[PDB]
Design a binder for this molecule. Structure first.
Ligand code: A1L89
Ligand code: MN
Ligand code: MN
Length: 269
């Protein structure tokens, strides 16, 4: 069976309880995770240890909080007490866990399922070939010995409009924002980097990225997490918003792909 779970955010107990509910069995089953494995919840260390131990039984994409953790680890960004990352940062296997984390993908594709997953979704300005090339470019910088330089370069809100002509810092910044921060678009597909509200509460003319028809969404299903204020609701057919806000006091959601059956674990917070 194939299971897809939204943002875990250190909610180790809820993750394990949800996997027991579906009798997840590595070697018979595969787990997809939308990213944001860490921060806010109490168990980021246990979450990373477990997810790494799954090997080929898990398909992860990196989220914005995963990248922030890497930036803190690398001395690029300051640790926020609210993120509850110190046990992970001080763990004896921190290097092993975080060097594994920075090598994980930004994008997962299964052609037999016609299924695409990224943390925030796929911007309507990208076709599949472009999304794959952009994922490969940022994965390359994150997997390299010089990854702290990129992590520092990644911060920024512009450019917010994709072009194949983009180069350098702006190209990397856009790619990072599209895969890990995107929620709303202007009518032309350009990214808004400020509104984090639900679609009904957003100021005009902003619309959810998935409300603008794009080439990837026309041919593939897209699963994503990230957008907690969406509450996993209000999406079109073929769009699966899996982040139901577990670390916020909401729920952890698991979707089984074969029958599109949902399983939900209440937050312990
Ligand atoms: N049910 C909800 N109803 C309404 N507002 C909700 C709900 N749940 C959370 N919020 C708010 O939604 C903000 C972003 O929290 P989030 O988890 O959605 O996303 P995130 O973890 O990536 O954090 P953020 O850095 O803000 O997003 P990014 O910059 O685009 O990258 C948080 O203040 C949170 O009060
Ligand atoms: Mn999140
Ligand atoms: Mn996120």
């Amino acid at each position: 069976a194939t299971y897809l779970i939204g943002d875990v955010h250190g909610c180790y107990d809820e993750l394990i309880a949800l996997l027991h509910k579906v009798e997840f069995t590595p070697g018979k089953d595969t787990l997809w995770l939308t990213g944001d494995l860490v921060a806010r919840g109490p168990g980021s260390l246990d979450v990373l240890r477990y997810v790494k131990s799954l090997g080929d039984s898990v398909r992860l994409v990196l989220g914005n909080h995963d990248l922030h953790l890497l930036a803190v680890f690398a001395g690029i960004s300051r640790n926020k007490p609210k993120d509850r990352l110190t046990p992970l940062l001080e763990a004896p296997d921190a290097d092993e866990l975080l060097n594994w984390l920075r090598r994980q993908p930004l994008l997962q594709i299964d052609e037999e399922k016609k299924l695409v997953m990224a943390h925030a979704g796929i911007t309507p300005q990208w076709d599949l070939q472009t999304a794959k090339e952009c994922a490969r470019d940022v994965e390359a910088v994150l997997s390299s010995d010089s990854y702290p330089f990129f992590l520092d370069a990644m911060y920024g809100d512009m450019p917010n409009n994709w072009s194949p002509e983009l180069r350098g810092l702006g190209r990397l910044r856009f790619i990072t924002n599209a895969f890990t921060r995107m929620r709303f678009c202007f009518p032309n597909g350009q990214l808004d980097m400020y509104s984090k509200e639900s679609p009904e509460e957003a100021p005009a003319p902003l619309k959810p990225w998935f409300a603008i028809p794009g080439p990837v969404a026309e041919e593939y299903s897209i699963a994503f997490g990230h957008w907690a204020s969406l509450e996993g609701k209000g999406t079109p057919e073929g769009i699966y918003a899996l982040d139901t806000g577990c670390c916020w006091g909401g729920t952890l959601t698991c979707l089984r792909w074969e029958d599109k059956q949902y399983f939900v674990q209440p937050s312990n917070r």
